[PDB]
Amino acid sequence: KQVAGTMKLELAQYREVAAFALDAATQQLLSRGVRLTELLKQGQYSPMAIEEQVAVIYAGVRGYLDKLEPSKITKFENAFLSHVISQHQALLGKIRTDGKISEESDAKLKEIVTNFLAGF
Amino acid sequence: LALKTIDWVAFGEIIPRNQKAVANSLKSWNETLTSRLATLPEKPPAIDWAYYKANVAKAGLVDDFEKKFNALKVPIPEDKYTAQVDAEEKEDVKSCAEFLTQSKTRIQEYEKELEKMRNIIPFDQMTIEDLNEVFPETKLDKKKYPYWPHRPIE
Amino acid sequence: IDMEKSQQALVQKRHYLFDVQRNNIAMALEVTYRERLHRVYREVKNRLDYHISV
Numbered sequence: 001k002q003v004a005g006t007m008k009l010e011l012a013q014y015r016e017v018a019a020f021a022l023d024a025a026t027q028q029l030l031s032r033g034v035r036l037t038e039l040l041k042q043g044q045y046s047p048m049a050i051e052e053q054v055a056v057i058y059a060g061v062r063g064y065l066d067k068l069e070p071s072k073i074t075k076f077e078n079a080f081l082s083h084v085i086s087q088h089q090a091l092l093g094k095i096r097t098d099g100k101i102s103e104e105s106d107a108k109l110k111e112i113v114t115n116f117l118a119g120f
Numbered sequence: 121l122a123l124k125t126i127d128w129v130a131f132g133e134i135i136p137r138n139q140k141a142v143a144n145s146l147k148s149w150n151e152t153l154t155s156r157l158a159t160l161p162e163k164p165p166a167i168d169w170a171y172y173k174a175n176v177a178k179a180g181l182v183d184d185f186e187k188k189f190n191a192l193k194v195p196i197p198e199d200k201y202t203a204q205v206d207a208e209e210k211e212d213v214k215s216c217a218e219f220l221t222q223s224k225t226r227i228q229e230y231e232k233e234l235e236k237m238r239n240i241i242p243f244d245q246m247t248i249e250d251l252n253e254v255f256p257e258t259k260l261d262k263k264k265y266p267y268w269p270h271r272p273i274e
Numbered sequence: 275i276d277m278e279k280s281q282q283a284l285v286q287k288r289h290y291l292f293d294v295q296r297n298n299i300a301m302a303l304e305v306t307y308r309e310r311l312h313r314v315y316r317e318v319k320n321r322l323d324y325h326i327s328v
Contacts (some may be wrong), residue, residue: 124293164315176326197306
């Protein structure tokens, strides 16, 4: 909820931005909605918990991949998901224990975010 | 469970420009193989001697087939990391030799260069010849450009 | 001078790449073995079914 309330709001704004067809503010909102759409959907039969949910929620909420191609967003998203499932899997358990936004967990988040960003 | 390490983000910065794109292809196939190894389990799915036995009419058949599977053998693969190891060691040799040799030689050369750079002659105490040697580019060309003052009209 | 130093450093560190190549080969072999295991499993299960089902 913390990781993505603003994310949902910005999705709404990008729709309000999508309500048009050259503000670099609007352009930024556009790239943001681009990533948001490139991410939100999913394929059939992919059960999971809110874990990767809150993860990518902060990640897009970070928007440090807004530069990354929204086309490349889905691929690098699979990449980051695999990275988290492998390494920060224990850190994922930690965030699960983080029944609150742990600034420590948040820092691990930004760190592994840069890490997977290199892996991109 | 073996995989030796390159900092792939940095590791892209190790190859000569020959086929570093092919190197990237190799790294991508490596990540692909990592995912693939993640997919399947290391061991077989199990087999029920007595469970499927009581479950099947082929009961003692189920146990005997469990025994046969214990006897049955799938072929294990083969490895050639030895060739890779030899290539890796020889490359380490060649590259290290070339580096620690030519880089160090140029290091000495540019070290002398820096020394001479700290060794700039004072202008008034710099003869015309002082510069002419120091800046060989001021050479008289006194054959190619002999005619006193032996230089182009510029 | 800095360039010579940096070129030396990078060419030296390169060996991690050969490590990764070993990684690729080792993963290939391990996957082959694991897949052979699982394939044997599936064959055994198919054989077991071929009688219980009948």
